[PDB]
């Protein structure tokens, strides 16, 4: 009715005055004003370890807090933490459900928890009097597939599900104590900061949103995609972001200012992104595309400083230690390969 | 080599041993029958308590020394999309369908058929990227509901360019052939027909057949005979 | 959890017996397994280790070729049997909560154990000290030495200290001399390096005294350190 046309007019308005608002404040482009650094070399590296064991796809893995430990989750129903250093199997953990979708490593090394396609997050205990990695309490109440989980604290946890909400756990009380809503799309991904205050997310509507943990309320909105988003996260320093979607398209957000800085694009390749990763300083990008193949880009002048390629299938998981030492790459084929 | 203490050699242990459970727990999993139950929801998929027993929901059950394992995924209510590929070592993708209600035209919208509705959900189960290579089964619906209705009123003719009518025999047949002729692989796939019956003896036998032919081929397939 | 063990008691030199041990509460199937021989007032020594599943077998230089072991995993019982007995074979057998995977600590978990009285790499044994009086409320110091630099490539020290109390079962107080162990009192610690090693105690009271003896984690049949009793 009339009261809908004019609610309709006043959004186009709002949209309208942050458009322009966002555009008054672009004067500069990040290449041209980083150009004058030097261009780093071309790096070169080699498999140093290739981890076997899994049976089936792997679609996620964690890096965990000692720069030497890890995660990985896959469809043969089988949990599995790994020892970077001789290749070693630490833990070898059955799942309830054979379908999962993502992974997470406690910080302080005592909690992982998986969960998709079940509607249900698990929490497991990895250090307990019994000796072995028994779930601690499982968490339900969610109405779609859960693609992200991470650990805010080692009592407070923040998931991404297929119902398109994200609702921040209490692992004491087993109830949800804050609910982000907003998507019009399935949220995918989503990524924490260092001071564990601010997080963003991606959905399948091409939009991101900066939510808040403490008073559960967003912020600020970030568009420019034009496909799915499954992978992201945030910058070392803590100002700034990089997404990944199905475009062929890795583009660089930035929390303090609300303009597009960094973005990707090339003409040889027209695959999507299913992961994306950060180093220490944060000089080069790493995008593990799915073209059978993974990508190291850097983050100057938008210019490929090498090529990563020991995978025959598809990938779908990546990582950087703390410390930066190493990066570890994944793949469809039931194949871990560390790179230093 | 030797530099390696008593705590390596015992970790090197723990680690060879996952690796024998890992292994051995690998080769239970592909002696199983995996099948993908999909459907509409009102074509007979409660009919589950007696025609094949004595987010996702599972139900396992053994019919002469074989294991089968089907999952109902109508509930995930979610973006097919986006979660698809997750069945791809999948057999016999079953499409459990309810025709003998299209007679009696319901659309649950009032511009829309059963038939059409049917004929949607087969090419998108059947025309993806994914899923070649996997054989499809069919179980039409209990006959006693469509002979009800198709004598008492000649409301067959709306079906589109149909001559024939109040033929119990030849509209199964037409409605069969349509069902079939709906793939597009043509060398590779297959389409299994079965009459669904009030004895659970019928509706498992078929099935039992189905899946053994399947594997006889793609046994054949393997071995480089055909 | 709790471990109960049995087998206790007086053997003749000449004769045969078993010992049992029962695991509940934790996968006795995913546990290396280790028996340590507790000479009374004196230094002591550690005996076998068997990983689980019975992957390998060990046994000490004394009573090597002279006593059989067998494991039963469907009933969590590991066994002992005896044919020739010596008169240095007085022991205090713990299974151990303990298997040999990074952020673990080998002899972690020693739960309760049992005894064994006999009727009548691997460094040397030292251990100086024999029984100091002390007052509560100030540091306790005492030393135990080696004769290698155990500073290997990986920097991993084998050193391990565990408190024995009158009428007690001993349990693990501190491993590695930079890791302690849980459900043990924050007091205590320790530091070293090189070739000598000393443990500290920060704060003193009535519950701080005991025996403690020092280990090295070398050549699995690994020698121990000497028993410093403290008294009040």
């Known amino acids: 009715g009339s009261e809908l046309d004019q609610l309709r007019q006043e959004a186009e308005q709002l949209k309208n005055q942050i458009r322009d608002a966002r555009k008054a404040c672009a004067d500069a482009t990040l290449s041209q004003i980083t150009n004058n650094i030097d261009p780093v070399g071309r790096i070169q590296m080699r498999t140093r370890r290739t981890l076997r064991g899994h049976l089936a796809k792997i679609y996620a893995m964690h890096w965990g807090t000692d720069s030497r430990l890890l995660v990985s989750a896959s469809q043969d129903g089988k949990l599995i933490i790994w020892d970077s250093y001789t290749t070693n199997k630490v833990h070898a953990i059955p799942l309830r459900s054979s379908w999962v979708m993502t992974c997470a490593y406690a910080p302080s090394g005592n909690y992982v928890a998986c969960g998709g396609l079940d509607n249900i997050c698990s929490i497991y205990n990895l250090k307990t009097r019994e000796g072995n990695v028994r779930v601690s309490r499982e968490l339900a109440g969610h109405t779609g597939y859960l693609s992200c989980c991470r650990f805010l604290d080692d009592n407070q946890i923040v998931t991404s599900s297929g119902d398109t909400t994200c609702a921040l756990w209490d692992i004491e009380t087993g109830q949800q104590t804050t609910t982000f809503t907003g998507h019009t799309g399935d949220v995918m991904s989503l990524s924490l900061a260092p001071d564990t205050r601010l997080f963003v997310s991606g959905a399948c509507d091409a939009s991101a949103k900066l939510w808040d943990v403490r008073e559960g309320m967003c912020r600020q909105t970030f568009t420019g995609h034009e496909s799915d988003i499954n992978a992201i996260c945030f910058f070392p320093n803590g100002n700034a972001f990089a997404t990944g979607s199905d475009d062929a398209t890795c583009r660089l957000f930035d929390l303090r200012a609300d303009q597009e800085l960094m973005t990707y694009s090339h003409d040889n390749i027209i695959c999507g992104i299913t992961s994306v990763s950060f180093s220490k300083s944060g000089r080069l990008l790493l995008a593990g595309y799915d073209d059978f193949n993974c990508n190291v880009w850097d983050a100057l002048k938008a210019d490929r400083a090498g090529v990563l390629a020991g995978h025959d299938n598809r990938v779908s998981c990546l990582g950087v230690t703390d410390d930066g030492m190493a990066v570890a790459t994944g793949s469809w084929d039931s194949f871990l390969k560390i790179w230093n | 080599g030797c530099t390696l203490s008593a705590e390596d050699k015992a970790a090197v242990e723990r680690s060879k041993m996952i690796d024998r459970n890992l292994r051995e727990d690998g080769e239970k999993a592909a002696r199983e029958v995996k099948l993908l139950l999909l459907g509409a929801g009102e074509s007979g998929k409660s009919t589950i308590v007696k025609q094949m027993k004595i987010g996702i929901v599972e139900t396992h059950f053994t019919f002469k020394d074989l294991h089968f394992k089907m999952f109902d995924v109508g509930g995930q209510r979610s973006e097919r999309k986006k979660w698809i590929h997750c069945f791809e070592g999948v057999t016999a993708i079953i499409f459990c369908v309810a025709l003998s209600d299209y007679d009696l035209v319901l659309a649950e919208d009032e511009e829309m058929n059963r038939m059409h509705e049917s004929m949607k959900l087969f090419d998108s189960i059947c025309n993806n990227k994914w899923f070649t290579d996997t054989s499809i089964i069919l179980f039409l619906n209990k006959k006693d509901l469509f002979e009800e209705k198709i004598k008492k009123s000649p409301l067959t003719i709306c079906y589109p360019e149909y001559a024939g009518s109040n033929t119990y025999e030849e509209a199964a047949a037409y409605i069969q052939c349509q069902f079939e002729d709906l793939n597009k692989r043509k060398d590779t796939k297959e389409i299994y027909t079965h009459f669904t019956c009030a004895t659970d003896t019928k509706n498992v036998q078929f099935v039992f057949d189905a899946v053994t032919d399947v594997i006889i081929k793609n046994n054949l397939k393997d071995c480089g005979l055909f | 959890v709790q471990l109960v063990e049995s087998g206790g008691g007086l053997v003749q030199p000449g004769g045969s017996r078993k010992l049992s041990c029962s695991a509940s509460?934790?996968?006795?199937?995913?546990?290396?397994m280790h028996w340590v021989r507790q000479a009374p007032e004196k230094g002591l020594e550690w005996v076998a280790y068997?990983?689980?599943?019975?992957?390998?077998?060990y046994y000490a230089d004394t009573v090597k070729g002279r006593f059989t072991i067998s494991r039963d995993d469907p009933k969590n019982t590991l066994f002992l049997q005896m044919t020739s007995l010596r008169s240095e074979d007085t022991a205090m057998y713990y299974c151990?909560?303990?298997?040999?995977?990074?952020?673990?600590?080998?002899?972690?978990?020693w739960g309760q154990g049992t005894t064994l009285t006999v009727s009548s790499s691997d460094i040397v044994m030292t251990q100086a000290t024999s029984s100091v009086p002390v007052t509560p409320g100030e540091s306790v110091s005492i030393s135990c030495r080696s004769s290698?630099?155990?500073?290997?490539?990986?920097?991993?020290?084998?050193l391990y200290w565990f408190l024995q109390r009158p009428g007690q079962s001993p349990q693990l107080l501190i491993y590695?001399?930079?890791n302690l162990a849980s459900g043990v009192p924050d007091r205590f610690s320790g530091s070293g390096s090189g070739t000598a090693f000393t443990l500290t105690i920060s704060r003193l009271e009535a519950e701080d005294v005991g025996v403690y003896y020092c280990?090295?984690?070398?050549?699995?049949?690994?020698?121990f350190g000497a028993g410093t009793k403290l008294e009040l």
């Open positions: 151990v909560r303990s298997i040999y995977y990074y952020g673990s600590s080998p002899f972690d978990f």
């Open positions: 509460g934790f996968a006795f199937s995913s546990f290396g």
């Open positions: 068997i990983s689980s599943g019975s992957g390998t077998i």
């Open positions: 290698k630099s155990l500073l290997h490539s990986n920097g991993n020290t084998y």
């Open positions: 590695r001399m930079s």
């Open positions: 280990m090295q984690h070398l050549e699995y049949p690994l020698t």
